Amino acid sequence: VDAEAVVQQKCISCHGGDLTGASAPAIDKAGANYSEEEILDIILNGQGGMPGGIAKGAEAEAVAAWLAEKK
Ligand code: HEC
């Protein structure tokens, strides 16, 4: 899975092109604040103002792993 391409397709409309926040909060350092599993749960299911379902399965897991290393 190309995790960065997925994030640019699916996440930047709310989180900003460089992930530093736009309508929604920054995620560029999400791994400093969340575990990989917490990030996966957010992607699959949403959280607070974020909807669920935006990515699934291996795509979601690859994005969670990529973000979890960003600190
Ligand atoms: C707007 C329709 C969104 C899209 C598209 C995505 N996210 Fe989001 N996200 C959004 C909001 C409004 C919030 C805040 C909810 C909260 O209280 O935390 C979030 C939050 C996150 C978080 C947790 C907080 C943080 O790190 O800032 C993460 C890790 C996150 N979002 C990731 C994420 C990814 C990877 C997305 C693309 C697959 C994605 N979000 C899309 C709104 C929206």
Domains of the chain: 1-71 (1.10.760.10)
Taking the centre of ligand 1 as the mean of its atom positions, its distance from the CA of residue 24, in whole angstroms, is 7
Tokens (6 digits) for 46 = 């949403």
Q: Which amino acid is at 14?
A: C
Way it was determined: X-ray
HSE-CB of 68 using CA atoms within 13 angstroms: 15
Task: State residue 47 phi and psi, 5-degree precision.
Answer: -170, 125
Evaluate: CB of 8 within 6 angstroms of ligand 1. no
CA angle (66, 38, 41) in 5-degree steps: 95
Q: Where is 17: in which H helix or E strand?
A: none
CA atoms of 53 and 11, how far apart (whole Å): 12
Residue nearest to atom 39 of ligand 1 (CA): 11
Q: For residue 57, give both structure tokens.
A: 């399965």
Residue whose C-alpha is closest to residue 42's, from 54, 33, 32: 54
Amino acid identity of residue 15, one-letter, is H
Give the side-chain half-sphere CA count within 13 A for 21: 5
Q: What is the resolution of this structure in A?
A: 1.0
Tokens found for residue 44: 């699959």
39 in ligand 1 pocket by Cβ < 6 Å? yes
